[PDB]
């Protein structure tokens, strides 16, 4: 049963109306954790390093094949607890947009 502090789109601790910290559990907590994990560049953990998405070696670079980017994103999604797998992972490329869509099948 995952649980996480409530954060806004600015990725900062967002409090409630009474000035407390909200602890989301299960589905919403897992969704927020997945969104936060997909925004972490590789080599940003002093205590994991090899964890994180390849935003500068697989994406944003003249990479021949985006299968490595797909694998890195899949690993980042699966790294979150209670994720099990991914039902669908679209890696569509627009003119200058790297559109990624996930269909996580988290156990909750």
């Amino acid at each position: 049963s995952t649980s996480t502090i409530r954060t806004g789109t600015n990725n900062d601790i967002l409090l409630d109306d009474n000035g407390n910290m909200v602890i989301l559990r299960d589905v919403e907590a897992c969704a927020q954790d997945v969104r936060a994990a997909m925004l972490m560049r590789t080599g940003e953990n002093i205590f994991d390093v090899n964890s994180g998405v390849g935003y500068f070696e697989y994406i944003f670079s003249p990479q021949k094949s985006y299968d490595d980017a797909r694998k890195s994103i899949a690993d980042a999604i699966l790294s979150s607890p209670d994720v099990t797998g991914i039902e669908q992972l679209d890696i569509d490329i627009t003119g200058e947009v790297f559109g990624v869509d996930a269909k996580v099948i988290t156990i909750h």
Binding site: A74, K103, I107
Partner: protein, 170 residues
């Protein structure tokens, strides 16, 4: 085979349902052939006079082999997750033939010039033999049968009685 008149023009044939959470998995597989082979062994015992008593019969676990085409990468990844999934038993419904307690044993993906978009795959499941296929449960939380844990070898802390008291006070 016949036995059921669905009278519906959209009935789905194959279904791999995760037994827990009761969810479809790998719903985009394009199945091509399914072989649900059983197995059992006799105990032929030759004895004295020209004769052989077969004794009893032991039911070996079911094997089921599914040939399929995976059209997409997410489906291939779902198949890989099925193989790597060691904690759930699946239920395979091929054609009016339901098999519970089914676990993926093998999988072979094939990539050939004969098919560049999709990938042929040969899944193989084996059944998990259980002592009681029909278990007995209870609705309410009070009335479980007692579970023994045997010897424990109680481990150690240093907290003193004062801390336990203060905790009980709080």
């Amino acid at each position: 085979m016949l036995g059921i008149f669905t009278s519906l023009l959209s009935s789905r044939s194959f279904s791999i349902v995760d037994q827990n959470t009761n969810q479809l998995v790998a719903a985009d597989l394009r199945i091509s052939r399914v072989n649900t082979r059983f197995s059992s062994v006799g105990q032929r015992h030759m004895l004295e006079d020209g004769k052989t008593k077969m004794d009893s019969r032991t039911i070996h676990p079911m094997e089921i082999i599914v040939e399929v085409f995976c059209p997409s990468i997410d489906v291939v990844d779902q198949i890989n997750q099925l193989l790597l999934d060691r904690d759930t038993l699946y239920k395979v419904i091929t054609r009016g033939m339901v098999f519970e307690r089914m676990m993926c044993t093998s999988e072979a993906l094939n990539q050939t010039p004969d098919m560049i978009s999709a990938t042929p795959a040969r899944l193989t499941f084996s059944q998990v033999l259980v002592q009681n296929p029909k278990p007995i449960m209870f609705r309410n939380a009070g009335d479980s049968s007692m579970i023994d844990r045997g010897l424990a070898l109680a481990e150690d802390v240093v907290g003193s009685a004062g801390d336990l008291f203060d905790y009980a006070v709080n």
